[PDB]
Amino acid sequence: VRRFPWWWPFLRR
DSSP, X not given: OOOOXXXXXXXXX
16 A cells, blocks of 8 residues: 655644
């Protein structure tokens, strides 16, 4: 699976 952008670090919950 691949998707993790370069701005996801903040997204989670």
